[PDB]
Design a protein around this ligand. Structure first.
Ligand SMILES: NC(=O)[C@H](Cc1c[nH]c2ccccc12)NC(=O)[C@H](Cc1cc(-c2ccccc2)no1)CP(=O)(O)c1ccccc1
Ligand SMILES: [Ca+2]
Ligand SMILES: [Ca+2]
Ligand SMILES: [Ca+2]
Ligand SMILES: [Ca+2]
Ligand SMILES: [Ca+2]
Ligand SMILES: [Cl-]
Ligand SMILES: [Cl-]
Ligand SMILES: [Cl-]
Ligand SMILES: [Zn+2]
Ligand SMILES: [Zn+2]
Length: 159
């Protein structure tokens, strides 16, 4: 994940490989679309859902070991991870399905916020030192616009 590359195109495509059993597919698709919309709203980037491995960002829910050298740890802890821009697995976003995925206030983790964070990494964004920023390393649920001034500046500095 220590990559230093950005996408050389702005028409990004994503493929939802599979789903979590905690939420309806329609809810999941909408959550991801809304997470992407957060970044496309402040950049010339566009995100189009596709149905092929040829997508730039492949999204998948997994548990424990799932193919890469970074297995999930089950309940809590690591919630998900994504690889920086590049071919192959690069740009892909993985979500730990051992977590209780939900939305808004309440128990469990907001798939919307975590996705937005993950897509940030999939776009090449590094972590923020601002505790209130979306790209902060530690998950924290709060209401209001997910993107903090620092997140906007970071993404705009790249695209
Ligand atoms: N419960 C949390 O806040 C955990 C804590 C954590 C960070 N790194 C690790 C590593 C191993 C275990 C836990 C953990 N953070 C995450 O699951 C984030 C993912 C995350 C953060 C958020 C988030 C942060 C701030 C505000 C809102 C959501 N949603 O999803 C991991 P990352 O920053 O995407 C990452 C990816 C690749 C390599 C190394 C780290
Ligand atoms: Ca735009
Ligand atoms: Ca990819
Ligand atoms: Ca976990
Ligand atoms: Ca789950
Ligand atoms: Ca909730
Ligand atoms: Cl599925
Ligand atoms: Cl939204
Ligand atoms: Cl939410
Ligand atoms: Zn993975
Ligand atoms: Zn992160």
């Amino acid at each position: 994940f220590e990559g230093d590359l950005k996408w050389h195109h702005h028409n990004i495509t994503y493929w939802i490989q599979n789903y979590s059993e905690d939420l309806p597919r329609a809810v999941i698709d909408d959550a991801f679309a809304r997470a992407f919309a957060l970044w496309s709203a402040v950049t010339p980037l566009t995100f189009t859902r596709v149905y092929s491995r040829d997508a730039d960002i492949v999204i998948q829910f997994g548990v424990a070991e799932h193919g890469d050298g970074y297995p999930f740890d089950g309940k809590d802890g690591l919630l998900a991870h994504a690889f920086p821009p590049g071919p192959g697995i690069q740009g892909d976003a993985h979500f730990d399905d051992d977590e209780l995925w939900s939305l808004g206030k309440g128990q469990g983790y907001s798939l919307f916020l975590v996705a937005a964070h993950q897509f940030g990494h999939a776009l090449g964004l590094d972590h923020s030192s601002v505790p209130e920023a979306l790209m902060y390393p530690m998950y924290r649920f709060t209401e209001g616009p997910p993107l903090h001034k620092d997140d906007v500046n970071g993404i705009r500095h790249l695209y």
